[PDB]
Amino acid sequence: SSSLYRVLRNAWEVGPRSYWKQLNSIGDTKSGRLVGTDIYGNKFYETDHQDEIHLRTRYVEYKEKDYDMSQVEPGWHFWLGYGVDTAPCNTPKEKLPIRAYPYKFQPNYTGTPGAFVTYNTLKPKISAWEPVTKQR
Amino acid sequence: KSIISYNGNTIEIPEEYTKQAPNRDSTWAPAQASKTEIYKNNMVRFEQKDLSKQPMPYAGIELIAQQPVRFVHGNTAVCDGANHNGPGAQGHPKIFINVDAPGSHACQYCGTRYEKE
Amino acid sequence: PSWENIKDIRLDPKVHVDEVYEPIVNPADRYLQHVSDLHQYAKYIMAALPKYIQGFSVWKDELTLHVAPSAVIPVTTFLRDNTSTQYKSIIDITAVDYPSRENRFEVVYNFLSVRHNSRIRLKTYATEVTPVPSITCLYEGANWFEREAYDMYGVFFEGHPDLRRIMTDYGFEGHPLRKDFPLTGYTEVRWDEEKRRVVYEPLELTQAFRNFSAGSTAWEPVGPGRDDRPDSFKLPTPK
Amino acid sequence: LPGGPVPVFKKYTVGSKGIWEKLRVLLAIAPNRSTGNPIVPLYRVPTPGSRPEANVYQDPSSYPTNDIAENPYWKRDHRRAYPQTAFFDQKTVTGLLELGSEATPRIADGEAGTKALANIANGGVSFTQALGKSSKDVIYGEVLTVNGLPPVAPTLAPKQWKIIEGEAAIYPKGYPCRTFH
Amino acid sequence: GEHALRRYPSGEERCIACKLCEAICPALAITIDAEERIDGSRRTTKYDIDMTKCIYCGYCQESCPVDAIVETPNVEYATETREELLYNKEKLLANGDKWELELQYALDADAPYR
Amino acid sequence: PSVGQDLPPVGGYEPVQWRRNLPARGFRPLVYLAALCGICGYGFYRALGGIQERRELKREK
Amino acid sequence: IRAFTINFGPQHPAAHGVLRLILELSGEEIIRSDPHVGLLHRGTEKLIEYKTYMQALPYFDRLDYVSMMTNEQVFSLAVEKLLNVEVPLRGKYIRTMFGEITRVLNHLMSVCSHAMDVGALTPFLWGFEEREKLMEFYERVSGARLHAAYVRPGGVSQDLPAGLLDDIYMWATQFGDRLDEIEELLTDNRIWKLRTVNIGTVTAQDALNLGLSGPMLRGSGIPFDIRKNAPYDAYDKVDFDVPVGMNGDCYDRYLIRMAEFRQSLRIIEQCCNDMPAGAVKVEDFKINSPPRNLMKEDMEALIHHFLLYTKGYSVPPGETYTAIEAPKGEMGVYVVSDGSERPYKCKIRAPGFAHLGAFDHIARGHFLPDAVAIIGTMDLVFGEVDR
Amino acid sequence: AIIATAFAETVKFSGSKQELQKRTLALYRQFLRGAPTFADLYEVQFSIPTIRTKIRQEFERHRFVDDLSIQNVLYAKGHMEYQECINFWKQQAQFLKYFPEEDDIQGRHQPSNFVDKFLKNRA
Amino acid sequence: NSFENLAQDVNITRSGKTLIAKGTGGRSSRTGYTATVFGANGFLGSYLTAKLAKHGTTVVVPYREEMAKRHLKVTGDLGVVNFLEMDLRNLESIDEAVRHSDIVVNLIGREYETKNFNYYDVHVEGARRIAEAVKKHNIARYIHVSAFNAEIDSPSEFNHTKGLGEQVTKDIVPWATIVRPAPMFGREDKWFLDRMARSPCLVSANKFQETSNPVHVIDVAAALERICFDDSTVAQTFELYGPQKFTQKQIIDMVSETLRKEVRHIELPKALYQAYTKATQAIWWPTYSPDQVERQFLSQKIDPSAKTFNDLDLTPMELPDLMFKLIRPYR
Ligand SMILES: NC(=O)C1=CN([C@@H]2O[C@H](COP(=O)(O)OP(=O)(O)OC[C@H]3O[C@@H](n4cnc5c(N)ncnc54)[C@H](OP(=O)(O)O)[C@@H]3O)[C@@H](O)[C@H]2O)C=CC1
Ligand code: SF4
Ligand code: SF4
Ligand SMILES: [Zn+2]
């Protein structure tokens, strides 16, 4: 629910410094258990507590003040929108897609000068002719 | 690095971005259009913009060349590329490869080269 | 006795058959007894009004009637007024062109006998020049429908108040559902800055439109197909 | 009455506690009302990305369809067995009148029966001429019914109507809508 | 939501230009040119989605035999220019690099029901 | 064949509630009227006696 | 000489629609009206002649964008009647109960949006919430939300998840409370009953002459419904009462919509108990795709998988008019097959088209706030009417 | 929808060329009478006799059609455009379709000879 | 949709770059000219790059503020208009903004001093700073604009510095093409009609008799674009004057006869006039300038040795023909 008792007891469980951060971050008091963190660095949680509405269970605590969505890792981003039971820290490595190259994680850079730019991948259709004269 | 911007003026990007790939500098298609052509085409909408946060998507021709060439006991090989963990139908469809000629033979979907031995 | 003690459904025995035995059937048999019924009605209609019916046809219990252009109103009265034949209700009308033939457009009507739970379809024909009359004298909602298929084709409805275009640009010229008329049309829209208004400039695309019906087999790969004609109403052989 | 009010412990809803439940039973319009929240460890668990039922799932199929040995395709074909669009001229109905029917033909002399066919197939007679030519039994057999009645506009499956009225109705009286079925 | 091109294990582009994705994108958002590369196998030269008109039919996913383009369930990619919205091959391979985890997770629940 | 797809329970589900769940709550309307007149008349008994009290206070001033 | 005639809405008069609508007011009384529709008119019919039936299917969930699934259904029905194929049993029930949860969605949007247009704010949120619960149920079956790439002209796109058929029952038990709850402040409701008691009377024979259908024609008193008159999709095999109104008012047209929730929930009760097993698509691989399990294994499945996605499936020539009972009304479709794989022509009969066409026969004499209660119970979503 | 709008007429097909001519003459009088209303309503930049010299030359475009019934469809289209302009139904953006040539003098190098066509390969 | 922009199709530019205008000239087409317009958010610049992007020349737009830059996107297709930020101060941004520009113009002129820019800053110094890089990059068809009455002489520090900027443009990259337009009038002009549309005071000196011939702004923009592309414009001073010389009393009476209102008149002399305009500089929204005082005693000094509209086959319109349109919504 949203009663005074619940917000009071969860604030008393978490701790007032993290509470004072969280109230400036979200409007709610939420007490999870650190299921896992991000390669970008984003602490996630999951709520046991019985007085929760549907799909209020799992949530992010970000890192940056200038947060948004799509700053999360994909294999987490599934679980944040509740795709899986098993968060990727607890999945077997058989379900890990094996890759032959390192990973970089560009989140999004819209408006930032790191924005994506487009171009046609291929050259022009018809190549010209280079001028090669012939002294007769 | 410094390439002519159709006027004698040179544009100067670092050698980390005169690249087809982080894995390969050279082109691999007849109409590949190397980046030296591309910045030569439209640097107009590339100024005041970052050079780092574009894709550079780790091109495949280097990654396929260092996979071990497998061996087949009999004559006709089979390729799927399918995992044995994933509960479904993935990979490329079940085509077969004759390996008789001297040299390996890439499965024309997955690019894995097989050899008769 | 409380919501903590409610059972789940996700663990239980469910029904589990090894292999369902679904019989095969052509989905036309269920029509057939009615379809052979319907013909007896349809022939009756031609015997009823032989001045105005060029023909009837039916294909999988959709009864289709064949009316000359100057012939619409005397049929539609009879389709409305008879106790045995009361359709009472326009459903949709539109046109279909066939520019291969001389009379270009053909105008199709749909009705719905809500008493007797039946449908009927009425086809006439009209060249773009010549009209078809309006059934807005009887059917009241049809004046809206006739307002529609005017603009899409140019096919008229003589005897009709409020005949004017609808569901297109007001200053539009031509007709959209016409096989000579191109897909993107002629004029596109952009906001000119200097006139402080939008202007209608002729068409320029970024990407040219690409149909893919150029890859097409000439003969329609569907076969001839059997009939469902009633044994009463096909021609008896001699001897 | 088979779908009437059921009490709220079979409704799959977040419910209440137990002194507040004892409160809200005294304070509600009906006690058997769900607050709308589904139960969290029941509704949408396990997530559809991780379903153990989804691990083994080959194909749904039926026995005359998946039978490899017995059927060919052309027996179970359906696209090339469509009915033909039966078209009827004005003229072929005159053929149906005088030449007769495959049920009851009116034509002997199969050589000259073609000649009697063909002028009508070329337009020797007219339809109203055939109507005057058609006998009373002809008209009452193959145009009208056997009582000489016009055929009712025929329907696919006629659905007779009940009117449910009493306590099984979805509204009692006073409310204007009835619930026929 | 938005698109990506998968890759093989040991990293190969997985898209052949069967052009089915060009053939049945009912808004014609797909545009492909493709050439035989150095080794002789077919690969795509330019693969391009017009994401102005990607209508989220998802038919383009169901049209790949080799399962190269998929539907990444990201929706949070809102751009500020139309120029940013023309996904060429490089952006889609970058998305296939990025979302590779979740696309494995999704096909581990959908590849039966495909 | 058919395996792994979802099916109903072999026992089936419970029957749901689809009727008008409308209890005619409260009291008889005459009880509301009689309680109204009771609350009124008790208020008038408190009012007019206090008014006459105030009038005697006015005399005293 | 004429009234000081107004433009009703450029942008946001009636929610979910661009209702440009000429009114001639003489006492705040409409002597005549003239709605100009065309503001959404994308010209979709000119497009659908250039695409294959395979591709032509998500034109139609764009049409009537509050009840996508009946449009999907009616085009699949027109093509299955045209192709002479038969969807299997499992397919019939799954299409049936999706076409009824879409009915629940449609009336849940329409009644609450009409209550907001009148001014009742609370169902306008209490209903859209349960609509979000149903967005979830579109989401597990098919693609994203609000535009389902679903029922194919061969039948069904694909099977359910492993547990939707369970989960929807957990929803269906509590929809009854959440429906009677919004019923409790609009049905008796002397404000609503005042505003809607005889407003816009629609007599019987004039309802037929205006070509109207669905809840409006059934509100006028005529017992007509395609689910029971000309049945299909095991609506025969599922017991289902139908409500029929008494007056020609908007109040019957309200009360019938309230009733159809109670009816379409009983649909789900008789569907989730008796969902059979069997093939969810059509049996053959010649009008829809083979499953992706065996096309990587069989040579025959590839060529079907390729031709259905380059050419598509070939249709016998002919023409059909299949009309079914959308929750707006009788929605029809008239397709004319070339015999090619593009439809040579395809008209829609959007249901609200004649509803808009029958406006100023009903709206004469009434008031201008009374000219709003008439709007959203003939349900002009305007995705339908022009196209 | 028993009743029409203000100026809309039941469409009816004149049997003679003269009756068509009578209707067209009355129609041009209707345009010419309503022309000062248009410059007020559509708020146009320019003057009323420019409207009038367009309305004249548009009928000059179709003075030389032989057929009765092709002039009949032509008259019906003209009456509908009258019906649009007499109300607010067209807007001034759509109203200014009829003057492309007036609002902007064309621009430099309007191609006239073969050469100006050729140097931009006929535009 | 035709190229009424160009003379031809194929154009090599002066610097030797090949430009082929493919397609048929509309919005979707491409012409090939990479253009750069400094200060394009200004009132001349919007009408300028509107016609410049109407035929699909790629317009590089340097901006200063992020809000006013937005309403110039609509006149270009994808890749046609582009944006990049810069200050007049930072030379690297000037250097960057003109790297691939075929052609380039600078309508930078500010009628008042800020607390960070004077006339000597933004007319003679910054123009030097930018056309230096133009000389560094061999950019073809450089166009500079100065105002009318652009002298070397004192009495308007604005006009004192405009001719200084002219001499600097003649000095470095010396073939630069200089244009001096007349006073300008358009829909919401800067200080010439909208100031005359509404005014609680309407006070200025001279007893309203300074003389000029104002030009409609779209005629200036069409004139500029017809300059932009041909030959026979290089290193030539351009007087661009309207068809007939006016006086301020004539102008204001022509305004007020269509307004049918009493436009106020105060016309007080210079002494009390100056000190009121002195105090307006501390206010962030722009007010009438204390150096706009001086130009009221000045008039249109036309150079006879320049090239008119009729050089490039154009006839601009007359202000009496336009007076009903432009101050119509104040009726
Ligand atoms: N009738 C007239 O007004 C006359 C004017 N001219 C000249 O024509 C040109 C354009 O005319 P007009 O539209 O009226 O004037 P503008 O409004 O265009 O003048 C300001 C423009 O130049 C920019 N500008 C000024 N200073 C700077 C600076 N330090 N940094 C960046 N940008 C600056 C402005 O930037 P921002 O967009 O951020 O505001 C704005 O774009 C001007 O140069 C003017 O001097 C010549 C003859 C007649
Ligand atoms: S989902 Fe996207 S890629 Fe697929 S057909 Fe639609 S627009 Fe094309
Ligand atoms: S993603 Fe699939 S449809 Fe698209 S080009 Fe690759 S194989 Fe073809
Ligand atoms: Zn392979």
* Cβ atoms within 10 Å of G234's Cβ, excluding its own: 18
Phi, psi of C61, rounded to the nearest 5 degrees: 35, 50
**In angstroms, rounded to a whole number, what is the distance separating the alpha carbons of residues C121 and C119?**
7
Type and span of the H or E element at C29: helix C29-48
**Domain hosting residue A117, numbered range:** 1-136
Q: Are A84 and D49 in contact (CB under 8 A)?
A: yes
- For B60, B82, B101, H71, the CA distances from B70, given in Å and listed in that order, are 19, 16, 15, 81
What residues pair up with G325 in beta bridges, in sequence order?
G330
- DSSP characters over F1-30: ---SS---BTT-PPPP--S------S--HH
| Unique residue bearing structure tokens 């001014």 | G119
- DSSP characters over I17-53: -EEE--S-SSSS-----EEEEETTTSHHHHHHHHHHH
Number of domains in chain B: 1
What structural domains and CATH numbers belong to chain G?
4-378 (1.10.645.10)
B7 Cβ contact list (under 8 Å, min separation 6): I15, I16, I17, I100, I137, I138, I139
- In this structure, the residue with its CA closest to atom 9 of ligand 1 is I107
- DSSP characters over C81-124: H-SSS----EEEEEEEE-TTSSS-EEEEEEEEETTTTEEEEEEE
| Unique residue bearing structure tokens 């959308």 | G326
Q: How far is CA H15 from the centre of its chain?
A: 24
Q: Are D15 and C2 in contact (CB under 8 A)?
A: yes
Name the residue type at position C23.
P
Q: Do G36 and H89 touch (CB under 8 A)?
A: yes
Selected residue of H83, H87, H90 to mutate for chain G interface (largest G Cβ count, 10 A):
H87
> D102 is written with which tokens?
């495959």
**In angstroms, rounded to a whole number, what is the distance separating the alpha carbons of residues C228 and C237?**
18
* Cβ atoms within 10 Å of F45's Cβ, excluding its own: 10
**In angstroms, rounded to a whole number, what is the distance separating the alpha carbons of residues I321 and H50?**
14
3-state SS assignment for residue D57: coil
Check residue G201 and report its DSSP letter.
Answer: -
Q: How far is CA G318 from the centre of its chain?
A: 26
Three-state secondary structure string covering I160-216: HHHHHHHHHHHHCCCCCEEEEECCEECCCCCCCCHHHHCCCCCCCCCCCCCEECCEE
* Method for structure elucidation: cryo-EM
Q: Label the pairing between strands C63-67 and C53-58.
A: antiparallel
Report yes or no: C118 at the D interface, CB cutoff 8 Å.
Answer: yes
Residues in chain E: 114
> H102 is written with which tokens?
């007036």
Q: Note the helical H segments in H1-123.
A: 17-41, 48-61, 68-86, 92-95, 100-103, 114-118
**Closest CA relative to residue G336, chosen from G30, G45, G34:** G45
Q: How far is CA A45 from the centre of its chain?
A: 13
> G339 is written with which tokens?
């015999």
Q: Number of CB pairs < 8 Å for C and D? A: 179
Residues in chain F: 61
Type and span of the H or E element at F55: helix F29-60
> G43 is written with which tokens?
């010209």
**Closest CA relative to residue E41, chosen from B42, I144, B60:** B60
Check residue C133 and report its DSSP letter.
Answer: B
Q: Do D62 and G279 touch (CB under 8 A)?
A: yes
**In chain C, which residues have their Cβ closer than 8 Å to the Cβ of F13?**
9
Phi, psi of B98, rounded to the nearest 5 degrees: -85, 125
3-state SS assignment for residue I291: coil
**Closest CA relative to residue G224, chosen from G321, G320, G325, G322:** G325
> G104 is written with which tokens?
């629940």
3-state SS assignment for residue C156: coil
- What is the C-alpha end-to-end distance of chain E, expressed in Å? 17
CATH annotation of I10-330: 3.40.50.720
- Ligand 4 centroid to Cα of residue B80, in Å, is 5
> A39 is written with which tokens?
């390669």
Among the partner-chain residues C96, C144, C169, the one whose CB lies closest to the CB of G336 is: C96
Q: How far is CA E38 from the centre of its chain?
A: 23
**Closest CA relative to residue E23, chosen from I91, F16, C210:** C210
Check residue I318 and report its DSSP letter.
Answer: P
Report yes or no: E107 at the D interface, CB cutoff 8 Å.
Answer: no
Q: Which residues of I301-317 are buried (b: 16+ CB within 10 A; e: fewer)?
A: eeeeebbebebbebebe
Check residue G32 and report its DSSP letter.
Answer: E
**Closest CA relative to residue A31, chosen from A7, A47, A15:** A47
Type and span of the H or E element at E30: strand E30-36
**In angstroms, rounded to a whole number, what is the distance separating the alpha carbons of residues D133 and D49?**
77
Ligand 3 pocket mutation, candidates E63, E87, E88, criterion most atoms within 8 A of CB: E63
Q: Do F11 and C12 touch (CB under 8 A)?
A: yes
- Chain A nearest-CA residue for B38: A119
Check residue I75 and report its DSSP letter.
Answer: G
**Closest CA relative to residue E109, chosen from F5, A79, D52:** D52
**In angstroms, rounded to a whole number, what is the distance separating the alpha carbons of residues D95 and D2?**
60
Q: Which ligand neighbours the alpha carbon of I47 most closely?
A: 1
**Closest CA relative to residue I237, chosen from I156, I144, I159, I107:** I144
Q: Do I8 and H119 touch (CB under 8 A)?
A: yes
Angle between helices G122-141 and G164-183 (to 10 degrees): 170
C101 Cβ contact list (under 8 Å, min separation 6): none
> G348 is written with which tokens?
């829609």
Number of domains in chain A: 1
| Unique residue bearing structure tokens 């209660």 | G373
**Domain hosting residue B112, numbered range:** 1-117
Check residue I71 and report its DSSP letter.
Answer: G
Q: Which atom of ligand 3 is nearest to the CA of E23?
A: 3
- CA dihedral of G351, G357, G359, G364, whole degrees rounded to 10: -160
Q: Are C201 and C184 in contact (CB under 8 A)?
A: no
3-state SS assignment for residue B22: coil
3-state SS assignment for residue I237: coil
**In angstroms, rounded to a whole number, what is the distance separating the alpha carbons of residues I147 and I156?**
12
- For G76, G142, G326, the CA distances from G73, given in Å and listed in that order, are 5, 14, 10
Angle between helices I319-326 and I248-259 (to 10 degrees): 40
Q: Are C193 and C185 in contact (CB under 8 A)?
A: no
**In angstroms, rounded to a whole number, what is the distance separating the alpha carbons of residues G34 and G356?**
10
Q: Which atom of ligand 2 is nearest to the CA of E24?
A: 5
**In angstroms, rounded to a whole number, what is the distance separating the alpha carbons of residues I52 and I32?**
12
Name the residue type at position E75.
V
Name the residue type at position I95.
D
What residues pair up with G345 in beta bridges, in sequence order?
G336
Compute the radius of gyration of chain H from its Cα atoms: 18
**In angstroms, rounded to a whole number, what is the distance separating the alpha carbons of residues I19 and I5?**
14
CA dihedral over H123, I2, I8, I11, signed as positive or negative: negative
Name the residue type at position D107.
I
**Closest CA relative to residue G260, chosen from G372, G99, G383:** G99
Residues in chain I: 331
Type and span of the H or E element at I145: strand I142-145
Minimal C-alpha gap between G255 and chain H (Å): 26
Report yes or no: F26 at the D interface, CB cutoff 8 Å.
Answer: no
Half-sphere exposure of B32 (CA within 13 A, CB side): 18
Binding residues of E for [4Fe-4S] cluster: 15, 18, 21, 25, 54, 57, 60, 64
Report yes or no: G296 at the B interface, CB cutoff 8 Å.
Answer: yes
Ligand 2 pocket mutation, candidates E18, E24, E60, criterion most atoms within 8 A of CB: E60
> I85 is written with which tokens?
């930020």
Q: Label the pairing between strands I142-145 and I177-181.
A: parallel
Q: Which ligand neighbours the alpha carbon of E72 most closely?
A: 2
**In angstroms, rounded to a whole number, what is the distance separating the alpha carbons of residues F28 and F33?**
9
C143 Cβ contact list (under 8 Å, min separation 6): C134, C136, C160, C161, C162, G357, H1
F3 Cβ contact list (under 8 Å, min separation 6): D56, D57, D58
- For E83, I41, I85, I229, the CA distances from I67, given in Å and listed in that order, are 20, 10, 12, 31
Q: Which atom of ligand 2 is nearest to the CA of E69?
A: 3
What residues pair up with C66 in beta bridges, in sequence order?
C55, C123
Q: Are C31 and D72 in contact (CB under 8 A)?
A: no
Q: Which atom of ligand 1 is nearest to the CA of I192?
A: 1
> I160 is written with which tokens?
């004192």
3-state SS assignment for residue I86: coil
Burial of H25 (0-12, 13-18, 19+ CB in 10 A): exposed
Binding residues of E: 15, 18, 21, 25, 54, 57, 60, 64
Type and span of the H or E element at I126: helix I126-137
Ligand 3 pocket mutation, candidates E69, E89, E103, criterion most atoms within 8 A of CB: E69
Q: Which atom of ligand 1 is nearest to the CA of I191?
A: 3
H25 Cβ contact list (under 8 Å, min separation 6): none
- Ligand 2 centroid to Cα of residue E65, in Å, is 16
Q: Please state whether at least 3 CB pairs lie below 8 Å between chains A and H.
A: no
Compute the radius of gyration of chain G from its Cα atoms: 22
Q: How far is CA I129 from the centre of its chain?
A: 19
Among the partner-chain residues E48, E74, E102, the one whose CB lies closest to the CB of A75 is: E102
* Cβ atoms within 10 Å of E85's Cβ, excluding its own: 20
Q: Are I127 and I143 in contact (CB under 8 A)?
A: no
Type and span of the H or E element at I277: helix I270-278
- Ligand 1 centroid to Cα of residue I276, in Å, is 24
**Closest CA relative to residue D104, chosen from D132, D145, D138, D81:** D138
Neighboring chains of G (3 or more beta-carbon pairs < 8 A): B, C, D, E, F, H
Three-state secondary structure string covering B50-117: CCCCCCCCCCHHHHHHCCCCEEECCCEEEECCCCCCCCCCCCCCCEEEECCCCCCEECCCCCCEEEEC
Selected residue of A69, A72, A77, A104 to mutate for chain E interface (largest E Cβ count, 10 A):
A77
| Unique residue bearing structure tokens 């404000």 | G191
**In angstroms, rounded to a whole number, what is the distance separating the alpha carbons of residues G8 and H16?**
43
What residues pair up with C86 in beta bridges, in sequence order?
none
| Unique residue bearing structure tokens 């086959």 | I313
I224 Cβ contact list (under 8 Å, min separation 6): I48, I105, I143, I179
- For C86, C90, C102, F45, I235, the CA distances from C71, given in Å and listed in that order, are 18, 17, 19, 88, 80
> I81 is written with which tokens?
């208009």
Q: Do H6 and G2 touch (CB under 8 A)?
A: yes
Q: Are G140 and G150 in contact (CB under 8 A)?
A: no
**In angstroms, rounded to a whole number, what is the distance separating the alpha carbons of residues I270 and A136?**
80
CA dihedral over F41, F45, F47, F48, signed as positive or negative: positive
Report yes or no: E58 at the G interface, CB cutoff 8 Å.
Answer: yes
- In this structure, the residue with its CA closest to atom 5 of ligand 3 is E17
- Ligand 3 centroid to Cα of residue H87, in Å, is 53
**In angstroms, rounded to a whole number, what is the distance separating the alpha carbons of residues I290 and I197?**
21
Q: Are C87 and C109 in contact (CB under 8 A)?
A: no
Selected residue of F5, F6, F19 to mutate for chain D interface (largest D Cβ count, 10 A):
F19
Phi, psi of F29, rounded to the nearest 5 degrees: -65, -30
> Does the bond joining D46 to the residue before it have cis omega, within 30 degrees of 0?
yes
CA dihedral over E82, E88, E92, E97, signed as positive or negative: negative
**In angstroms, rounded to a whole number, what is the distance separating the alpha carbons of residues D53 and C221?**
41
Half-sphere exposure of I284 (CA within 13 A, CB side): 0
Name the residue type at position C56.
F
CA dihedral over I42, I48, I54, I56, signed as positive or negative: negative
Neighboring chains of H (3 or more beta-carbon pairs < 8 A): C, G, I
**In angstroms, rounded to a whole number, what is the distance separating the alpha carbons of residues I228 and I218?**
15
Long-range contacts of H55-64 (CB under 8 A, 24+ apart): H55/H28, H55/H31, H59/H24, H59/H28
- For H45, I184, I242, the CA distances from I318, given in Å and listed in that order, are 15, 12, 7
Q: How far is CA E104 from the centre of its chain?
A: 14
- Ligand 4 centroid to Cα of residue B90, in Å, is 12
Report yes or no: E82 at the I interface, CB cutoff 8 Å.
Answer: yes
**In chain D, which residues have their Cβ closer than 8 Å to the Cβ of G280?**
60
**In angstroms, rounded to a whole number, what is the distance separating the alpha carbons of residues G253 and G241?**
17
Q: Are G384 and G350 in contact (CB under 8 A)?
A: yes
**In angstroms, rounded to a whole number, what is the distance separating the alpha carbons of residues E6 and E100?**
7
**In angstroms, rounded to a whole number, what is the distance separating the alpha carbons of residues I310 and I316?**
10
Name the residue type at position I216.
H
Q: Do G295 and B80 touch (CB under 8 A)?
A: no
Report yes or no: G302 at the B interface, CB cutoff 8 Å.
Answer: yes
- Ligand 4 centroid to Cα of residue A103, in Å, is 25
**In chain G, which residues have their Cβ closer than 8 Å to the Cβ of B87?**
none
**In angstroms, rounded to a whole number, what is the distance separating the alpha carbons of residues I132 and G286?**
71
Report yes or no: C193 at the I interface, CB cutoff 8 Å.
Answer: yes
Phi, psi of I316, rounded to the nearest 5 degrees: -70, 170
Half-sphere exposure of A15 (CA within 13 A, CB side): 3
- Ligand 3 centroid to Cα of residue H11, in Å, is 55
**In chain H, which residues have their Cβ closer than 8 Å to the Cβ of C164?**
8, 80, 83-84
**In chain F, which residues have their Cβ closer than 8 Å to the Cβ of D168?**
none
Check residue I125 and report its DSSP letter.
Answer: I
Q: Label the pairing between strands I177-181 and I238-240.
A: parallel
- What is the C-alpha end-to-end distance of chain H, expressed in Å? 50
